[PDB]
Specification:
Blueprint lengths: L7 E14 L2 E10 L4 E4 L14 H7 L5 E8 L12 E10 L4 E10 L2 E11 L1 E3 L2 E10 L2 H11 L4 H8 L2 E9 L5 E11 L7 E8 L1
Parallel strand pairs: 3-12, 4-11
Antiparallel strand pairs: 1-2, 1-5, 4-12, 5-9, 6-7, 6-10, 8-9, 10-11
PDB class: transcription
Keywords: palmitoylated protein, transcription
Assembly: monomeric
Amino acid sequence: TIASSRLRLLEYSAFMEVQRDPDTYSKHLFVHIGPPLEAVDVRQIYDKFPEKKGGLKELYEKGPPNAFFLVKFWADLNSTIQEGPGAFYGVSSQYSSADSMTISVSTKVCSFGKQVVEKVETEYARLENGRFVYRIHRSPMCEYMINFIHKLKHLPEKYMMNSVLENFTILQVVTSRDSQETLLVIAFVFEVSTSEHGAQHHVYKLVK
């Protein structure tokens, strides 16, 4: 459901993978994404992201408005896998467009509204089934996120985890590397899952 007029998000998964033996792998999903949308006023989350030059407010005013989305995540932080050192933490995602582009995906991890980590990945269009796809497979998490997840899991109470997550946000900004044009912007906010179903998500449309 997360698609602008120029680019669609097909998949987004953050996961840890553990090798139990050379022929056995166990994988746990923290978050995952595979209808009309309710609108949320974008002016309300300006404080949860960098608000200087290059910030959400500037980005939105630059437009286009139909490229801005808010995604609430209930992260699954249950240890359903045994772990052990050297486990693999990663993010996998796919995009698609009607037109061939070279895109730049910026992922800004934010603490208390301040950019703490930025990951920048350039991906080149692949013609596939009439359209063009962009695949970022098994992109390794920075040690910051890995340590953050660990800090969260060591907390005795899930309400304590949600307390920490209140000031944790992620801003993904996809641009056409050519024209510097904003193709897709997704703001991420987080909670810990409590349900037996596991990780959950809810998408909102950002309006002004």
